[PDB]
């Protein structure tokens, strides 16, 4: 065992705040933020280590669980021999060991999701798995938005203080989305639901599009693939999906309304755990769901059956 | 204190099935049908007693509380001192008495937010002042089902066996509530907002209407409030409320989407508790509420701030 992962496995994570973020976006200020980051990376990596000690040992005992658990306490190792940055150089050093470890944990979910389906035999308990899941995916999203955000720093990239847009418009970032999940709909039934979108549609506001980037996606590709299954005898004349935004001082909310059939009443208690798909990997909602939460927000689902789904994401302002 | 109400205070009702209704509807059937709602109401009327009784003393002392705790001891009373029912004229009699009742109670509702609004200075529970008033509220809908039906069995009115339709259209049962909330809609504002009614329009089952006919125009003059409030501006260019009709083997769902603003952060948590009202008696969202949930539904709020809101009213089926 590691005593270095020990000294820091339960020391408090210091939040940086997304205020903070646009506070400090420069040479001098990159140097506090780069020391800040240098410290505090490995303390979310050992939080991580400490997840994967906790696990039932038949579970933990996965080879592919372990390989996840073994590149942890390689992170871990990479950034603390790294010796402390006194100047840019030492700053831009980092950088670049920030990158590869990016890059390298890029399979993460798709590693532990592979591991947990090989363990289901001894799973009993879908509450201790979806702790496991939400706790491990939202800290791991926590310290890629750090990562991300301190390189994209270096950039002089138009309305972007690193991955924070200062001028978002929800709509522009739906559309973006809109357009691939009628493309990939369009390839497997020869057409796609026309998606509408209203409300707010001029709202423009600081946002990280990281998170919108993740949960927009499955969620479109759910109410898509849900409308063309509920109307394969009329592939051609299908029913809209209605996107609307709702921009107030505190959330953004986003509602998408599909005429798709709606989620049956025996699976509605089922739609939120991982592994659960009624698709020929089931990680899409509750992954969402965790992010939304993660981020001060929360994923909400309102069946209609025999009729359609609204899916409301409430995500909590920069302010 | 009377004793015979201490006997059947804690005695377990003894349910009637929504589908028993159905297999019972005649002339021995309605004696067999008589002799149990001669036994079942005082044990239903006994519940509500020691309800009043269990409430604490500076509230139970309120007279106008008061007043509907000795209303209830009055008809046990009443309903008790009546002979058992041997043959249909001594079920006849019975009747007569049950109508008595149904029309001395019908304020009960009034007096009891009257007691309790007298007695806010002594309430600092509202989750017991919830539970109260959903209990008896609901208890005393069943009552009232239970006395209207028996008595409507007396009657050959098309499409009805008591007060079961056995042809229920939502759709003209809303569209009979839309009218009714447009016409005083129009009075206070000189406009009203459109509604439309989609989904399942052509839907057709056995249901009883008596919730519905209460809860519809609740969650009408909220949507139609809302928007007129919403608009003052513009009052005669206002935004439709859209109706959405869901039916399936489980239950039915209602949806009814407005425009008017959503409702407010801060007032969310409170919307659903008694008194609260931002209106110029707060009772319609909490009492619709216990109304669903004691006949197996819910009603849920969906709010989007800035923009509107969307009501879910959901009813199990007979069956
Ligand atoms: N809009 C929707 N309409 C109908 N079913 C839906 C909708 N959204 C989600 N579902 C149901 O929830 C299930 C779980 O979804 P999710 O966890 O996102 O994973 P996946 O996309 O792999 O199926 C889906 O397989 C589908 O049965
Ligand atoms: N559709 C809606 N849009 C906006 N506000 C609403 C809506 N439905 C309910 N509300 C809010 O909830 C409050 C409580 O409603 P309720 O308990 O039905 O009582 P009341 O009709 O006496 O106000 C309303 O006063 C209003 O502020
Ligand atoms: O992140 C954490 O703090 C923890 S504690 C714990 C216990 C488990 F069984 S999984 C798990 C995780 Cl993921
Ligand atoms: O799990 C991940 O996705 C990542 S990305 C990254 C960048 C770092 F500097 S540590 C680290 C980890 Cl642990
Ligand atoms: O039916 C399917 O299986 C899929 S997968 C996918 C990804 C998208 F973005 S849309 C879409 C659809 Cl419609
Ligand atoms: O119906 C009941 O069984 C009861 S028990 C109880 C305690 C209270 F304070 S009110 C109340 C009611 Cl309404
Ligand atoms: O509270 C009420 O609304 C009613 S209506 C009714 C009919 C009866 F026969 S008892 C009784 C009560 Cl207790
Ligand atoms: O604005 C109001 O106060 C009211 S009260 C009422 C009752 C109805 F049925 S509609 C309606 C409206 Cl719109």
Redesign the interface.
């Known amino acids: 065992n590691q005593s270095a992962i020990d000294v820091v496995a339960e020391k408090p994570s210091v939040r940086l705040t997304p205020t903070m973020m646009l506070y400090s976006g420069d040479g001098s200020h990159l140097l506090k933020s780069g020391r800040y980051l240098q410290q505090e990376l490995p303390v979310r990596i050992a939080h991580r280590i400490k997840g994967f000690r906790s696990l039932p040992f038949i579970i933990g005992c996965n080879p592919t669980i372990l390989h996840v658990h073994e590149l942890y306490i390689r992170a871990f190792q990479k950034l603390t021999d790294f010796p402390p940055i006194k100047d840019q150089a030492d700053e831009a050093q980092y950088c670049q060991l920030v990158r590869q470890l990016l890059d390298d944990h890029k399979d993460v979910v798709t590693l532990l999701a592979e591991g947990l389906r090989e363990s289901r035999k001894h799973i009993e308990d879908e509450k201790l798995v979806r702790y496991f899941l939400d706790k491990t995916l939202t800290s791991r999203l926590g310290i890629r938005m750090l990562a991300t955000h301190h390189l994209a720093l270096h950039e002089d990239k138009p309305d972007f203080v690193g991955i924070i847009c200062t001028r978002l418009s929800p709509k522009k970032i739906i559309e973006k989305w809109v357009d691939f999940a009628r493309r990939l709909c369009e390839h497997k039934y020869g057409n796609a639901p026309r998606v509408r979108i209203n ?2 549609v001029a709202a423009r506001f600081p946002f990280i599009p990281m998170p919108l980037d993740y949960i927009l996606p499955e969620l479109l590709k759910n109410a898509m693939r849900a409308t063309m299954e509920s109307h394969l005898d009329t592939p051609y004349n299908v029913p809209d999906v209605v996107i ?5 001082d ?2 953004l ?1 986003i ?1 998408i309304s599909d005429r798709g059939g ?1 989620i049956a ?1 025996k699976d509605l208690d089922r739609v939120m755990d991982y592994h659960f798909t009624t698709a020929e990997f089931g990680f899409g909602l509750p992954t969402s769901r965790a992010y939304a939460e993660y981020l001060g927000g929360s994923l ?1 689902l ?1 069946s ?5 789904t ?1 899916v ?1 994401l409430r995500l909590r302002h920069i302010d």
């Open positions: 409300g707010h609307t935004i709702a921009n107030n505190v959330d909310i509602r709606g009443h909400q309102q209609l059956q025999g009729i359609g609204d409301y």
